[PDB]
């Protein structure tokens, strides 16, 4: 839609599952949900999201979304998933 704000990207996109924790989704704010992700790194997730997990659409429900906004959307929450 528009990647003018990393907040607006997660709050428009990662806002159906991760907001409340639906479809078994990992919480928008956690430490133990993010710990096992921050063990390997960060980008390891930006690839998974752009790829689409099982319950996730291929491309994190995005289209023209650049790593700057994508990573910023992940890092808004913490710095991993
Ligand atoms: C449902 C409609 C989802 C939307 C929209 C997004 N995500 Fe998601 N995510 C969802 C589920 C059910 C899960 C599975 C949890 C698991 O067991 O792996 C996830 C997982 C992720 C992960 C991986 C977490 C892990 O521990 O491996 C990441 C990195 C992640 N999701 C990021 C992410 C972002 C940034 C999204 C918006 C661009 C997004 N997800 C949308 C369900 C859904």
């Amino acid at each position: 839609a528009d990647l003018q704000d990393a907040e607006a990207i997660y709050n428009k996109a990662c806002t159906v599952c991760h907001s409340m924790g639906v479809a078994g989704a990992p919480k928008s704010h956690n430490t133990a949900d993010w710990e096992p992700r921050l063990a390997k790194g960060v980008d390891n997730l930006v690839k998974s999201v752009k790829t689409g997990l099982n319950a996730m659409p291929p491309g994190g429900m995005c289209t023209d979304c650049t790593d700057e906004d994508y990573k910023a959307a992940i890092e808004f929450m913490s710095k991993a998933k």
Side-chain angles (χ1 to χ4, degrees), residues 2 5 8 15 23-24 31-32 36 40 43 46 49 53 55 62 65 69-70 79-80:
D2 261 288
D5 184 345
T15 191
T31 304
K40 290 168 181 176
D43 302 64
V46 99
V49 70
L53 217 89
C62 246
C65 302
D69 308 301
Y70 231 138
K79 46 191 287 177

Side-chain angles (χ1 to χ4, degrees), residues 20-59:
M20 292 290 106
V22 179
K27 209 151 291 109
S28 58
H29 76 123
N30 244 335
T31 304
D33 220 345
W34 297 76
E35 223 249 297
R37 303 291 127 187
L38 270 138
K40 290 168 181 176
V42 187
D43 302 64
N44 321 317
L45 292 325
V46 99
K47 48 139 281 174
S48 303
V49 70
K50 94 63 153 148
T51 286
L53 217 89
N54 310 275
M56 272 163 64

Side-chain angles (χ1 to χ4, degrees), residues 1 3 7-8 12-13 18 21 23 25 30-34 36 45 47 51 56 60 62-63 66 68 74 76-77 81:
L3 43 283
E7 174 136 56
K12 199 230 66 147
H18 283 246
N30 244 335
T31 304
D33 220 345
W34 297 76
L45 292 325
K47 48 139 281 174
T51 286
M56 272 163 64
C62 246
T63 168
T66 42
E68 61 202 326
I74 275 100
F76 176 95
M77 289 183 279
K81 52 123 291 218

Side-chain angles (χ1 to χ4, degrees), residues 3-19:
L3 43 283
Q4 253 78 280
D5 184 345
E7 174 136 56
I9 281 282
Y10 95 78
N11 191 34
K12 199 230 66 147
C14 338
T15 191
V16 185
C17 278
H18 283 246
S19 243

